From a paper:
To understand the architecture of the T6SS baseplate, we overexpressed and purified an EAEC complex comprising full-lengh [name] and [name] (residues 64–366) as well as the shoulder and neck domains of [name] (TssKSN, residues 1–315). The final model comprises [name] residues 1–315 (with a chain break between residues 220–230), [name] residues 45–587 (with a chain break between residues 393–404), as well as [name] residues 122–365 (with a chain break between residues 330–336,). The cryoEM map also contains a few unassigned densities that were modeled as polyalanine chains and which likely account for the N-terminal regions of [name] and [name]. The ([name])2–([name])1 complex assembles as a locally pseudo-symmetrical heterotrimer with a 2:1 stoichiometry. The N-termini of the three modeled chains form a three-helix bundle interacting with a triangular core, which is formed upon trimerization of the C-terminal domains of [name] and [name]. Each TssKSN trimer attaches to one of the two extended loops protruding from the [name] C-terminal domain. Loop 1 anchors a [name] trimer near the apex of the pseudo-threefold symmetrical ([name])2–([name])1 C-terminal triangle, whereas loop 2 binds another TssKSN trimer at the periphery of the triangle. The two [name] trimers are tilted ~ 60° relative to each other and interact together, burying an average surface area of 1000 Å2 at their interface.
Type VI secretion systems (T6SSs) are found in a broad range of Gram-negative bacteria and transport proteins directly into recipient cells. The T6SS needle oligomerizes in the bacterial cytoplasm and comprises an inner tube, made of Hcp hexameric rings arranged with helical symmetry, surrounded by TssB–TssC rings forming the sheath. Localization of the needle within a donor cell is mediated by a pre-assembled cytoplasmic baseplate comprising [name], [name], [name], TssE, VgrG, and a PAAR-repeat protein. To address this knowledge gap, we report here the 3.7 Å resolution cryoEM structure of the EAEC [name]–[name]–[name] complex.
Author numbering:
A (entry chain H): 337 to 392, 404 to 587
B (entry chain H): 45 to 84
C (entry chain G): 122 to 330, 336 to 366
D (entry chain I): 47 to 392, 406 to 587
């Protein structure tokens, strides 16, 4: 990615801003704001790499660019060891690779997937919790590893239901939402996986749900009838 | 003479029409990216 | 036949422009593609812009947020940050407001109050589900003046809340900055937009005795709940 | 000169595609949000099918789909093929007369005469909900609708022997909001809050059907021929009005110009993208494909059953895993003659396809009468067209219509719906037939205001929104259109009801300053 673009000409420093973050004078139309910008476009080159095109006489531009590695061997990445951590600190520090490195992950493609474009566009009009069918579908859009195991996890979602919650705290009456999901426990490696999945989901809901609303998650293990409940609220509240 | 000019013209029209349907996926992905920045 | 070549060339360039978004930005929501994005943002109906009275193109910067069914603190933080980068903000949920009662709690014989209604004494009830608190903090006098009533940042923030939150929730606004950045309250025979307000900003000059001062900015609310009911003459009355 | 014509002709076409600006993507999305915004509306009308009354012993149900063809219309002498959208429980009675009068008590009374078959078996006659259609001009029938439906004060059944004062327990109700008909093959969506709006602005006549409920509790003596009922209403029925025996009709139903096309064997010789579908006798220049209902063939694996792609996409679930089950999909596009071509996206397949009639002369159709109804019923029912037939209505495909349509759907849309300009702008999206009446009515919206509603329930503060709309009554056929419009608008507004707030509709009639309102719209749903 491009982190910064600043040039120099007869007008002094050329303060370009990224296009997608809409430019102040460009969009806000106010004074003491720039009208210079850039955008980046990428195409697939002959080696499969991305060719970066900058969309802006003899003006000079200083480009601050962060890079990564390209088409490295499949096997090498799984057998790569780490070298010494730069000894910035006074103490010597050795290193240990605690796991085989994860190779670069690309967004899913079959035939460019007009269906994926449509899936995202359709999603923008749906509530993720409206049904099990939607919840499964939407979550699946992030499974960029094409892992059959992750599929089975999501495929274990049997039903989604919700209720209004009436609860008290510090003498006040607060509203919330009860999110109940029924899972097929056979799609998970016991409680270990079910719990961690639920922990993630609970956190997600917190970041999705509206204001002045607390949310709790209940997961039901259908083969047994037991459930795991998440009843907590990490948001600052009731300031007065 | 005009028949020959027609065929030449039709060829050019073909290419222009084909371009309209060729660069469409570019704008399409750009739009989606603008909405969902992680998409591409 | 010069016109044949000319016209075909003209169309080529138009076709090229057709799919180059940046090229068509034109410093506002003027192009079809800009309007298309606003459509997805639920601002595609003509006449709606007139109810905002701002450079609506500003909202494009917030587009990814407006695709969500709820309105999270992440959003309010973005609004403040966008308008005046550097300004910090925090959000508290379940901000308490006092609500006047239509009738006092009294004792009756024929039509007594049931405890199922969770009654309170007759003067005021609490409300902790109607407001959130948005607290701002700045590091310079320029930003402070912009945030004070009459300033351009104050106005812009309300202009954005108008659409982003709409009628969902009201927002209480306050600013926490060093005393050294505030003006000395002074009288004037004529009021002004930048004039200090009695209950919000009118801080008295200190006799050469900086600590952080909390001042009020105002409150965001779209619907004033005034009285024009005009009881009723008739009603929908189908028995079905 | 010919070179010039060719050049200009083709350049025009190219320019048009460019100006259209991305239907290619937009339409595909819209169809999955608005299940019926990628279709035309076929012509339709209301036809009376009246059985011989003299001899009829039992009621008979007319099957839905029963076809009534038209007489030859336009060049080629083709015909239309209309079919009923409802099943009809024909009873052995008919309307004998319609008389408007007034009692000495000042109450207006509508006296409606009926007659029964010589052999009517009252144990068979379905006197539960008698369906009566108001067959009269809107300026009068719109009033009649309310006067009978909402203003009813008393109902009497007049029996032979001067027994006129027989009070009847029953009431009138509209049937235009019934779920059972829907007027289209849309039993899955049930988005009544939207469909009712297209119907109001287009084929309004569907709302002029009023049922009389509670006749099942009315015992009558056996007899032959005439009897009367009296509708006593709490008003001075407006002095200026026509009345006629033909104003009221029982045995009638809406019919639509839709029919089955031959299920020709579709065969392919490779996966050459999409295939073109076309019926036999297309040469008439009238027949047109409306929609594909089913796709099943015969392959080396047995019945080649395919699944409508949309059954997966509508859900928006794991398409990745649902799609492998032999999905199919269809697209349509106007050909060089303006007629729509249908394309199939996927061995012989049997394609069950419903069609209609496309381009035709408008005057020729308007003046065309219906032919005899297929003789399925025991009674040789006569055919009477109760209203000049419509011509096909096409959706607008201009400017940014489709994007306006998508914007409209969001729950949050409600927040901008706070002014007359926006309200008119959104209602306009449903006015696919731009006549004078709809414009006069639409432009009757003078102002829109929002007020807050605050109440406490079980200690909790409940929020809601009061949406007040001021109307110019001059754009309406009196109270009739105002109240019908209002009721429909309420049902629509309710769509935006939310778990975190309820809506309420209030209307003001500006010529009088008369306020009318509906009850709160509550719906504990997620904020889509």
């Amino acid at each position: 990615s491009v982190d910064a673009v600043t040039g120099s000409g007869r007008t002094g420093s050329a303060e370009y801003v990224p296009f997608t973050s809409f430019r102040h004078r460009g969009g806000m139309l106010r004074h003491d704001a720039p009208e210079r910008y850039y955008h980046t476009r990428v195409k697939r080159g002959v080696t499969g790499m991305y060719d970066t095109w900058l969309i802006l006489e003899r003006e000079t531009l200083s480009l601050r660019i962060t890079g990564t590695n390209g088409q490295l061997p499949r096997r090498a990445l799984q057998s790569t060891l780490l070298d010494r951590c730069e000894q910035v600190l006074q103490a010597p520090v050795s290193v240990r690779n605690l796991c085989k490195p994860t190779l670069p992950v690309y967004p899913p493609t079959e035939d460019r997937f007009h269906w994926r474009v449509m899936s995202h566009l359709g999603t923008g009009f749906l509530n993720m919790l409206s049904s099990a069918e939607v919840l499964r579908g939407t979550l699946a859009l992030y499974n960029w590893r094409d892992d059959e195991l992750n599929h089975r996890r999501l495929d274990a979602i049997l039903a989604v239901q919700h209720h209004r919650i009436q609860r008290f705290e510090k003498g006040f009456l607060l509203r919330g939402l009860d999110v109940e999901v029924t899972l097929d426990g056979n799609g998970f490696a016991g409680e270990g996986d079910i719990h961690l999945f639920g922990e993630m989901l609970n956190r997600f809901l917190a970041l999705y749900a509206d204001m002045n609303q607390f949310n709790q998650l209940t997961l039901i293990v259908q083969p047994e009838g037991k459930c795991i409940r998440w009843k907590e609220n990490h948001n600052p509240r009731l300031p007065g | 003479c005009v028949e020959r000019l027609f065929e030449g013209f039709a060829f050019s029209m073909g290419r222009l029409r084909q371009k309209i349907d060729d660069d469409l996926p570019e704008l399409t992905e750009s739009l989606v990216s603008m909405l969902w920045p992680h998409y591409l | 036949l010069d016109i044949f070549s000319h016209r075909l060339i003209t169309q080529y360039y138009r076709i090229w422009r057709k799919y180059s978004y940046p090229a068509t930005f034109e410093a506002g929501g003027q192009d079809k593609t800009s309007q298309y994005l606003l459509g997805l943002a639920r601002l595609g109906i003509p006449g709606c812009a007139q109810n905002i009275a701002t450079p609506v193109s500003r909202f494009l910067a917030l587009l990814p947020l407006m695709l969500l069914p709820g309105r999270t603190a992440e959003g309010l933080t973005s609004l403040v940050t966008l308008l005046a980068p550097g300004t910090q903000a925090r959000v508290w949920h379940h901000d308490r407001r006092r609500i006047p009662l239509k009738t006092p709690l009294t004792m009756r014989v024929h039509h007594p109050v049931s405890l199922k209604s969770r009654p309170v004494m007759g003067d005021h009830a609490t409300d902790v589900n109607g407001q959130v608190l948005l607290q701002l903090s700045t590091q310079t006098g320029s930003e402070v003046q912009g945030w004070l009533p009459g300033g351009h940042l104050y106005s812009d923030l309300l202009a954005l809340l108008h659409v982003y939150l709409g009628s969902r929730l009201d927002v209480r606004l306050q600013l926490c900055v060093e005393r050294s950045l505030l003006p000395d309250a002074r009288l004037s025979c004529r009021p002004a937009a930048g004039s200090p307000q009695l209950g919000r900003t009118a801080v008295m000059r200190t006799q050469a005795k900086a600590r952080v001062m909390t001042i009020s900015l105002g409150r965001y609310q779209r619907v004033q709940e005034h009285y024009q009911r005009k009881e009723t003459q008739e009603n929908g009355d189908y028995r079905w | 000169e010919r070179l010039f014509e060719g050049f200009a002709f083709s350049m025009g076409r190219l320019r048009q595609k460019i100006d259209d600006d991305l239907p290619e993507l937009t339409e595909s999305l819209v169809s999955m949000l608005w299940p019926h915004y990628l279709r035309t509306i076929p012509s339709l009308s209301v036809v009376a099918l009246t059985p011989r009354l003299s001899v009829m012993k039992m009621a008979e149900t007319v099957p839905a789909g029963l076809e009534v063809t038209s007489r030859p219309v336009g060049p080629g002498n083709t015909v239309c093929r209309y079919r009923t959208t409802r099943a009809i429980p024909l009873n052995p009675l008919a309307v004998e007369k319609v008389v408007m009068t007034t009692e000495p008590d000042g109450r207006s009374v509508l006296k409606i005469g009926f007659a029964c078959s010589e052999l009517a078996d009252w144990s068979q006659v379905d006197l539960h909900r008698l369906s009566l259609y108001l067959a009269a001009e809107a300026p009068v029938s719109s009033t009649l609708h309310l006067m009978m439906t909402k203003r009813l004060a008393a109902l009497y059944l007049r029996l032979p022997g001067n027994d006129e004062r027989i009070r009847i327990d029953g009431w009138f109700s509209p049937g235009g909001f019934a779920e059972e008909d829907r007027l289209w093959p849309k039993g899955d969506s049930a988005f009544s809050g939207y469909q009712l709006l297209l119907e109001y602005f287009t084929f309004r006549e569907k709302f002029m059907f009023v049922h009389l409920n509670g006749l099942e509790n009315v015992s009558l003596p056996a007899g032959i021929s005439g009897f009367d009922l009296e509708v006593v209403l709490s008003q001075p029925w407006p002095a200026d009005l026509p009345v006629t025996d033909d104003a009221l009709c029982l045995h009638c139903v809406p019919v639509i110009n839709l029919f089955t096309l031959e299920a020709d064997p579709l065969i392919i010789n490779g996966l050459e993208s999409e295939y073109l579908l076309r019926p036999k006798r297309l040469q008439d220049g009238y027949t047109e494909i409306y929609s594909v209902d089913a796709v099943t063939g015969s392959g080396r694996t047995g019945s080649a059953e395919y699944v409508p792609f949309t059954s997966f996409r509508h859900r928006g679930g794991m398409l990745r895993h649902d799609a492998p089950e032999r999905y199919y999909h269809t697209r349509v596009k106007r050909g060089v003659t303006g007629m729509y071509d249908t394309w199939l996206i996927l061995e012989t397949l049997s394609l069950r396809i419903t069609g209609t009639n496309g381009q035709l002369p408008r005057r020729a159709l308007q003046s065309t009468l219906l032919d005899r109804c297929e003789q399925v019923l025991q009674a040789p029912v006569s055919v009477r067209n109760l209203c000049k037939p419509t011509l096909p209505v096409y959706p607008p495909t201009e400017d940014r219509f489709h994007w306006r349509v998508m914007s409209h759907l969001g729950t949050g849309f409600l927040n901008m719906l706070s002014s007359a300009e926006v309200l008119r702008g959104t209602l306009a999206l449903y006015n696919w037939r731009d006549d004078e009446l709809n414009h006069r009515r639409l432009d009757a919206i003078l102002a829109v205001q929002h007020h807050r509603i605050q109440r406490f329930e079980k200690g909790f503060l409940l929020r809601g929104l009061d949406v007040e709309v001021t109307l110019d009554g001059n754009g309406f056929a009196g109270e009739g259109d105002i109240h019908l419009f209002g009721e429909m608008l309420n049902r629509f507004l309710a769509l935006y009801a939310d778990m975190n707030q309820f809506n309420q509709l209030t209307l003001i009639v500006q010529p009088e300053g008369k306020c009318i309102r509906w009850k709160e719209n509550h719906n504990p749903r997620l904020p889509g």
